[PDB]
Enzyme design. Structure first.
Site, PDB file in Angstrom:
ATOM      1  N   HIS A  76       0.801  -1.231   0.000  1.00 56.41           N
ATOM      2  CA  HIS A  76       0.000   0.000   0.000  1.00 56.41           C
ATOM      3  C   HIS A  76       0.834   1.282   0.000  1.00 56.41           C
ATOM      4  CE1 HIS A  76      -2.351  -3.331   1.643  1.00 56.41           C
ATOM      5  NE2 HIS A  76      -3.392  -2.761   1.061  1.00 56.41           N
TER       6      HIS A  76
ATOM      7  N   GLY B  62      -6.853  11.481   9.275  1.00 59.80           N
ATOM      8  CA  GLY B  62      -7.794  10.535   8.693  1.00 59.80           C
ATOM      9  C   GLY B  62      -8.279  10.955   7.314  1.00 59.80           C
TER      10      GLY B  62
ATOM     11  N   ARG C 145      -5.421  16.154   4.042  1.00 63.73           N
ATOM     12  CA  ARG C 145      -4.740  16.880   5.102  1.00 63.73           C
ATOM     13  C   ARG C 145      -3.229  16.679   5.065  1.00 63.73           C
ATOM     14  NH1 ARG C 145      -7.175  21.315   7.143  1.00 63.73           N
ATOM     15  NH2 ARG C 145      -9.067  20.857   8.368  1.00 63.73           N
TER      16      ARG C 145
ATOM     17  N   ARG D 265      -3.005   4.726  -4.319  1.00 67.26           N
ATOM     18  CA  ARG D 265      -4.412   4.835  -3.928  1.00 67.26           C
ATOM     19  C   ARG D 265      -4.793   6.247  -3.495  1.00 67.26           C
ATOM     20  NH1 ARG D 265      -6.873  -0.304  -2.352  1.00 67.26           N
ATOM     21  NH2 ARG D 265      -5.497  -2.030  -3.002  1.00 67.26           N
TER      22      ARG D 265
ATOM     23  N   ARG E 226      -1.446   9.906  15.383  1.00 72.91           N
ATOM     24  CA  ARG E 226      -2.684  10.136  14.653  1.00 72.91           C
ATOM     25  C   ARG E 226      -3.229  11.498  15.078  1.00 72.91           C
ATOM     26  NH1 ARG E 226      -7.799   9.860  13.214  1.00 72.91           N
ATOM     27  NH2 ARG E 226      -9.353   9.841  14.927  1.00 72.91           N
ATOM     28  N   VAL E 227      -3.629  12.302  14.098  1.00 69.62           N
ATOM     29  CA  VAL E 227      -4.207  13.612  14.366  1.00 69.62           C
ATOM     30  C   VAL E 227      -5.560  13.734  13.673  1.00 69.62           C
ATOM     31  CG1 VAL E 227      -2.083  14.878  14.811  1.00 69.62           C
ATOM     32  CG2 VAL E 227      -2.839  14.502  12.455  1.00 69.62           C
ATOM     33  N   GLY E 228      -6.633  13.633  14.451  1.00 65.58           N
ATOM     34  CA  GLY E 228      -7.981  13.712  13.897  1.00 65.58           C
ATOM     35  C   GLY E 228      -8.941  14.450  14.824  1.00 65.58           C
ATOM     36  N   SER E 229     -10.218  14.094  14.746  1.00 62.61           N
ATOM     37  CA  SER E 229     -11.386  14.543  15.076  1.00 62.61           C
ATOM     38  C   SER E 229     -12.154  13.490  15.832  1.00 62.61           C
ATOM     39  CB  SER E 229     -12.313  15.142  14.021  1.00 62.61           C
ATOM     40  OG  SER E 229     -12.759  14.135  13.131  1.00 62.61           O
TER      41      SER E 229
ATOM     42  N   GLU F 144     -13.987   8.140  18.187  1.00 64.12           N
ATOM     43  CA  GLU F 144     -13.433   8.185  16.858  1.00 64.12           C
ATOM     44  C   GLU F 144     -13.392   6.757  16.345  1.00 64.12           C
ATOM     45  OE1 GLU F 144      -9.541   7.201  16.932  1.00 64.12           O
ATOM     46  OE2 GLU F 144     -10.801   6.278  18.476  1.00 64.12           O
ATOM     47  N   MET F 145     -12.518   6.456  15.389  1.00 62.72           N
ATOM     48  CA  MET F 145     -12.591   5.141  14.736  1.00 62.72           C
ATOM     49  C   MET F 145     -11.265   4.410  14.511  1.00 62.72           C
ATOM     50  SD  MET F 145     -15.577   5.978  11.914  1.00 62.72           S
ATOM     51  CE  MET F 145     -15.519   4.312  11.289  1.00 62.72           C
ATOM     52  N   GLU F 146     -10.167   4.863  15.124  1.00 65.62           N
ATOM     53  CA  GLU F 146      -8.856   4.318  14.757  1.00 65.62           C
ATOM     54  C   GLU F 146      -7.878   4.021  15.892  1.00 65.62           C
ATOM     55  OE1 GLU F 146     -10.012   7.250  13.239  1.00 65.62           O
ATOM     56  OE2 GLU F 146     -10.557   6.477  11.269  1.00 65.62           O
TER      57      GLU F 146
ATOM     58  N   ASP G 208     -17.653  17.336  17.114  1.00 63.70           N
ATOM     59  CA  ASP G 208     -19.096  17.251  17.301  1.00 63.70           C
ATOM     60  C   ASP G 208     -19.465  16.770  18.697  1.00 63.70           C
ATOM     61  OD1 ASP G 208     -18.059  14.804  15.477  1.00 63.70           O
ATOM     62  OD2 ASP G 208     -19.690  14.029  16.728  1.00 63.70           O
TER      63      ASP G 208
ATOM     64  N   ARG H 113     -12.762  25.568  12.592  1.00 65.18           N
ATOM     65  CA  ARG H 113     -12.317  24.204  12.321  1.00 65.18           C
ATOM     66  C   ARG H 113     -10.861  24.161  11.838  1.00 65.18           C
ATOM     67  NH1 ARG H 113     -15.289  19.209  11.407  1.00 65.18           N
ATOM     68  NH2 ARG H 113     -13.809  17.629  10.637  1.00 65.18           N
TER      69      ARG H 113
HETATM   70  N1  LIG Z   1     -18.634  11.113  16.175  1.00 73.13           N
HETATM   71  C1  LIG Z   1     -17.654  10.414  15.540  1.00 73.13           C
HETATM   72  N2  LIG Z   1     -17.679   9.062  15.481  1.00 73.13           N
HETATM   73  C2  LIG Z   1     -16.707   8.356  14.859  1.00 73.13           C
HETATM   74  N3  LIG Z   1     -15.641   8.902  14.232  1.00 73.13           N
HETATM   75  C3  LIG Z   1     -15.516  10.245  14.222  1.00 73.13           C
HETATM   76  C4  LIG Z   1     -14.494  11.170  13.662  1.00 73.13           C
HETATM   77  C5  LIG Z   1     -13.305  10.701  12.875  1.00 73.13           C
HETATM   78  O1  LIG Z   1     -13.699  11.046  11.559  1.00 73.13           O
HETATM   79  C6  LIG Z   1     -13.817   9.865  10.736  1.00 73.13           C
HETATM   80  C7  LIG Z   1     -15.278   9.546  10.532  1.00 73.13           C
HETATM   81  O2  LIG Z   1     -16.023  10.708  10.179  1.00 73.13           O
HETATM   82  C8  LIG Z   1     -13.005   8.785  11.423  1.00 73.13           C
HETATM   83  O3  LIG Z   1     -11.654   8.830  10.956  1.00 73.13           O
HETATM   84  C9  LIG Z   1     -13.061   9.180  12.904  1.00 73.13           C
HETATM   85  O4  LIG Z   1     -11.891   8.863  13.620  1.00 73.13           O
HETATM   86  N4  LIG Z   1     -14.915  12.424  13.975  1.00 73.13           N
HETATM   87  N5  LIG Z   1     -16.125  12.376  14.711  1.00 73.13           N
HETATM   88  C10 LIG Z   1     -16.515  11.100  14.882  1.00 73.13           C
HETATM   89  N1  LIG Z   2      -5.258 -10.788   0.319  1.00 75.79           N
HETATM   90  C1  LIG Z   2      -6.103  -9.765   0.619  1.00 75.79           C
HETATM   91  N2  LIG Z   2      -6.561  -9.578   1.878  1.00 75.79           N
HETATM   92  C2  LIG Z   2      -7.408  -8.568   2.188  1.00 75.79           C
HETATM   93  N3  LIG Z   2      -7.867  -7.652   1.307  1.00 75.79           N
HETATM   94  C3  LIG Z   2      -7.470  -7.737   0.021  1.00 75.79           C
HETATM   95  C4  LIG Z   2      -7.777  -6.938  -1.197  1.00 75.79           C
HETATM   96  C5  LIG Z   2      -8.655  -5.722  -1.181  1.00 75.79           C
HETATM   97  O1  LIG Z   2      -7.690  -4.690  -1.284  1.00 75.79           O
HETATM   98  C6  LIG Z   2      -7.714  -3.850  -0.109  1.00 75.79           C
HETATM   99  C7  LIG Z   2      -6.518  -4.171   0.754  1.00 75.79           C
HETATM  100  O2  LIG Z   2      -5.321  -4.245  -0.015  1.00 75.79           O
HETATM  101  C8  LIG Z   2      -9.065  -4.069   0.543  1.00 75.79           C
HETATM  102  O3  LIG Z   2     -10.012  -3.142   0.007  1.00 75.79           O
HETATM  103  C9  LIG Z   2      -9.438  -5.498   0.127  1.00 75.79           C
HETATM  104  O4  LIG Z   2     -10.820  -5.690  -0.063  1.00 75.79           O
HETATM  105  N4  LIG Z   2      -7.074  -7.516  -2.208  1.00 75.79           N
HETATM  106  N5  LIG Z   2      -6.351  -8.639  -1.736  1.00 75.79           N
HETATM  107  C10 LIG Z   2      -6.560  -8.808  -0.418  1.00 75.79           C
END
Ligand SMILES: Nc1ncnc2c([C@@H]3O[C@H](CO)[C@@H](O)[C@H]3O)n[nH]c12
Ligand SMILES: Nc1ncnc2c([C@@H]3O[C@H](CO)[C@@H](O)[C@H]3O)n[nH]c12
Ligand SMILES: Nc1ncnc2c([C@@H]3O[C@H](CO)[C@@H](O)[C@H]3O)n[nH]c12
Ligand SMILES: Nc1ncnc2c([C@@H]3O[C@H](CO)[C@@H](O)[C@H]3O)n[nH]c12
Ligand SMILES: Nc1ncnc2c([C@@H]3O[C@H](CO)[C@@H](O)[C@H]3O)n[nH]c12
Ligand SMILES: Nc1ncnc2c([C@@H]3O[C@H](CO)[C@@H](O)[C@H]3O)n[nH]c12
EC number: 2.4.2.1
Lengths: 237, 237, 237, 237, 237, 237
Positions: free
Chosen positions: D4, D20, D24, D43, D87-90, D179-181, D204, D217
């Site tokens: 990747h 995220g 950015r 990508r 990681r720098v997010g929201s 958040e999600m990560e 939010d 923001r």
């Molecule tokens: N209320 C919420 N719930 C989940 N994720 C997020 C975020 C961040 O933004 C992305 C989803 O909008 C994702 O990267 C997450 O880490 N901001 N606010 C959020």
């Molecule tokens: N051996 C593998 N394992 C997991 N995902 C993938 C993929 C696809 O490519 C992305 C990860 O490289 C993700 O979107 C997945 O659906 N190609 N080959 C893969």
């Protein structure tokens, strides 16, 4: 009074140090506190209150394991006005570079207990210490010239694991020490809105041969206590 | 000696009564045993050995919670030749017809602990007492003219459970008493190849909030102790 | 009538023996009951009612597996006034000392089914038999001079388990027989407020692969049936 | 190169900031770094390496959610020698006292993902940041006149969770932001022996459902990046 | 012969239709097959082999529930050369737009059983039919002018759910019918490298009042059988 | 507009193709659609709407992993009236007979994610495609002279899974390809009442670890897009 503590409101300081061994609580009070008085003896779980450099401090054993320490920490917090718990324990090491007598500060605690999943709708609750308490302990250790590692503990339900395989996993994921309480205490602190920290000294290596003396081990244990007590003074700020 | 018991092979009888409270173990030794000698003091977890009607018997506290009692019961079994453990404690009732001071015999023990899942590949292990020991306790109770119910206990990890609604489920499934150890002791017995039984005295009602004092949960639960001791004699014959 | 039983209230005795095989139910009615009448034919799940030594008794197949027997036992309890279920079947042994034709009495039943977790908020429900029924079966066996072991069964969902290594764990925890129903019947009994017991005859050895034929697992398991029937008489007194 | 990231060992600094929103990265590179060069475009996930006050720094987006960021963080650590990830997010707030634009530092991260259970034999891995990185960020923020809250994040797999009630549980247990990560990055850091930190700005309120401007923001985003960058310099000493 | 099937290799066609009720198997053989002969009667689980439009076809009951049908389908596949299983059953509807007598084809089957988690390392196995068999059934239904919905079934362990709340969930997620076997049969097919399909007719609405006649229900049941048999001819191709 | 898509109702066609590589959207729009207009650019996730042989179609990337694609698919369905989603990506093969460049159609998708368990009360939701969409794709492929395999995908949360042994389990259970999104998209489709399909081209062998060219890669990608687009036309009839 509560079901497990025969004391009245005000008998405890707003900070309580807690080793697992009630005889160790007595040891700490006699060694480090002035004018310490016993304030609990129910079930032999001795608790004391005295002063450290003029600061009111309590110390009381928590017994072994999450279920035991969860009872005492909960009651201290909800019924005795306690704001901070500092667990002062021993732990086993799994990492080759963590040595007997190393001081370990549990910023987080992993566990194989189900108690936090029960609290947290079967998701992963990261059982963590209070950040400021962690910082205070790190700073107190530094002032004392004592090395301290900050990271994850693992709080085990079974001292005698049928597994064994879990130790390689703990090592892979960088666990600093294996003990039996931190995650439970952190869960209680979060549940009831208080603050907690676990500090341990490595008393055994769950997988090797290291050599130390009783005088040295006891010295390091006392260093951990000094760190805990001095960290309180720093937090008081 | 083992990590939590400073005694030598032969210091314990092959049957050990175990309340959670080490002070209760002290009470039992003073009240029911002849020529009792203290055989352990480590962590204040008092243990004694003496005789009851000429039968050698030990009594020692196991602390609160599965992780605590799992340590002591394991060590007794693997290093002290102990063949039978009889837990003697306290429990809270959830059924309307179950009253304070009622004696309950735990033929099974439900639990919210993970310890048996960890032993049993995440399936359901039915944590059960030894049948002969159950029958012995039933017969002893009958000879003493003491009422006793036989069925499931529930061994909780959290005395202060965040899930109040679980009590309705326990009630629905006819749980006789909520305590914190039986399922863990039964797990240890199976894992390490010994036999065990938990008998409890109802010390509080989880619904009515009626309850007994700490002093009462230390020195006034005589029916249960008598049943336990007499059941051993039956087992010997 | 209920969805799976074409009979009316009163057609069943308040005690029902239940093999998994409806043909075995037919054998039992012909061999051990007097004046037996067929009371159900739905899905070929034969059920009969007659008398044994003047005591009214029914026998009906429950099919293979927890989901099957859960249907029939529930319907008997909620709609046919049935108070006691005695499962009479077959099991495979994992312990070296347990032999073909050995009778085992399941005071508890482990399981890898999810049904009790679904009932018990994903905790461990100890699926246990009614104590008096167990004692009745033990006493009946003793009077008949038939050896019987009392302990845990394991109720498997998959007769053809992909997890061979689980048998080592069953053996380790002293499981007396592997069958497919007990834990589910015990769950139904608790949920719907009746009493139950499972007695099994060892029909195969999971290690040695020695086993009995289908014809044998239909018409030659007499010891177990005698114990079951005589245990009812003891229960009545 | 890795699946990747089309780059070679040495193209990335040992410290990588990761937003995220992939757009950015170019923004951070142009606004905060000097002499930045592009080092990845696979990508559309642009990566840049430059210096901040002489110190080599890289920046590249991580994509939304645990599975995406787990790929990039793993590859950076194992194939590009990366030692620290910030990681720098929201995040969304559930606590009433936590307000829009507040800076939150995730010393721990709870999650409803299964990834750490898969890593940690189905037990509770406490997904934590590197303590020194946490303290560096706290100190960097304070020097910038920004008060930062330190505690648990919750890393959600579903931005649109069907479980409304979980937000109340998060609030009860003091979760600072959703958040999600973070839990995923912390899991990767532990698995592969590196160090990580998530810093978020509250974008939010989960309940209130207000917010949030784009200018305010942008200002707050800049503050977060400055905190992150200055924290690295503190870390170097 | 196998433990549950007293027949020899070749006695079964390479396709077997399976209703839950063994009396229904006899019904199907007598109604739809020429020269049908009984080939199994162990445990009353009648199986037959005959021809449909010159094509060799077997039909045999599978009993109620995943554990029961898993036994028979496994043995048919591994011991009797069976390549395709078509379960022909009844199901309950949860969706308002799915009506009594609707024909439902289970391209997938959800379940509350643990059997597939046991197979699939505790992850989510999507229990699915063979695509070509699904297509053949859809095409046969069309040729017969019979409407058929293709989607998810739900295979329940408990016909009598203690829950109830699960029905709203099934409806929300678009489950077409509730039965007790499909997911288990699909798991077996995947485990042992065979092909399976479940078709059901809605015999009840798990939440409403609809009116039909016995003649109409029986007509639709026969339409399902025609679909299954004709789908085989299409697959033979 | 929605939090991740800056567009209005009507900007998207009722059918959306979604690649995992966001750069592929512009490619598909320019290569396959006529009169395409840009309808989203938030976070660089370009979305386009145009026609293919007169039929309105949109295309927009979904990002890697279940959590990312769950956001976009949910928003498209609930706020943009989208009725059908076709994911078009890449997967790794574990089966020896499945080779690079093969087209795989996921009628079902297994997963190690927790998202569907969270939706489905911790039971097994069989994450499935819309049957008609599956058959349209199969037919479209056949008309293009491309043989497509239909069966289960496995949607992994970790591209870098610490569980090597899971690949053998996937192989045993006939998993056709490993990717990271299908089970999540299918879960969203069921939750919000829409229809979805994942089509993948085999880009790698998990074991063999070979592949794969960029030209042959571009040709096969084009074939997949053509299959997807022609499948929509078949769906319209
Ligand atoms: N209320 C919420 N719930 C989940 N994720 C997020 C975020 C961040 O933004 C992305 C989803 O909008 C994702 O990267 C997450 O880490 N901001 N606010 C959020
Ligand atoms: N051996 C593998 N394992 C997991 N995902 C993938 C993929 C696809 O490519 C992305 C990860 O490289 C993700 O979107 C997945 O659906 N190609 N080959 C893969
Ligand atoms: N290797 C080890 N494993 C588990 N617990 C401990 C301890 C601590 O000591 C007690 C068990 O002996 C318990 O309170 C635990 O926190 N020291 N070493 C340990
Ligand atoms: N209502 C209750 N809930 C849980 N445990 C207990 C007990 C027993 O007493 C101790 C807790 O007070 C512990 O050992 C437990 O087994 N008594 N009443 C109880
Ligand atoms: N080795 C074995 N494994 C599982 N079940 C059984 C049985 C019982 O017989 C049936 C399966 O043959 C089923 O009702 C089960 O309870 N006998 N031997 C068994
Ligand atoms: N509402 C319902 N719930 C569960 N199973 C069924 C059935 C089928 O009938 C049997 C239960 O009566 C079982 O084999 C199942 O597949 N019909 N209606 C049902």
């Amino acid at each position: 009074a509560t079901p497990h503590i025969n004391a009245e409101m005000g008998d405890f300081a707003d900070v309580v140090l807690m080793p697992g061994d009630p005889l160790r609580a007595k040891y700490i009070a006699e060694t480090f506190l002035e004018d310490a008085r016993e304030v609990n003896n129910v079930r032999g779980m001795l608790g004391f209150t005295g002063t450290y450099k003029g600061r009111k401090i309590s110390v009381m054993g928590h017994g072994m394991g999450i279920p035991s320490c969860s009872i005492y920490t909960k009651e201290l917090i909800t019924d005795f006005g306690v704001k901070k718990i500092i667990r002062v324990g021993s732990c086993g090491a799994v990492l080759p570079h963590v040595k007997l007598r190393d001081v370990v500060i549990g910023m987080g605690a992993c566990t194989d207990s189900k108690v936090n999943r029960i609290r947290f709708k079967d998701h992963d609750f990261a059982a963590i210490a209070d950040f400021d308490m962690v910082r205070n302990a790190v700073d107190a250790a530094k002032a004392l010239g004592i090395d301290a590692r900050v990271g994850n503990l693992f709080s085990a339900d079974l001292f005698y694991s049928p597994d064994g395989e879990m130790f390689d996993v703990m090592e892979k994921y960088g666990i600093l020490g294996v003990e039996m309480e931190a995650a439970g205490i952190y869960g209680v602190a979060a549940e009831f809105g208080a603050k907690a920290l676990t500090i341990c000294t490595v008393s055994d290596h769950i997988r090797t041969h290291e050599q130390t003396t009783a005088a040295e081990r006891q010295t390091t244990f006392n260093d951990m206590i000094k760190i805990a007590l001095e960290s309180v003074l720093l937090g008081d700020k």
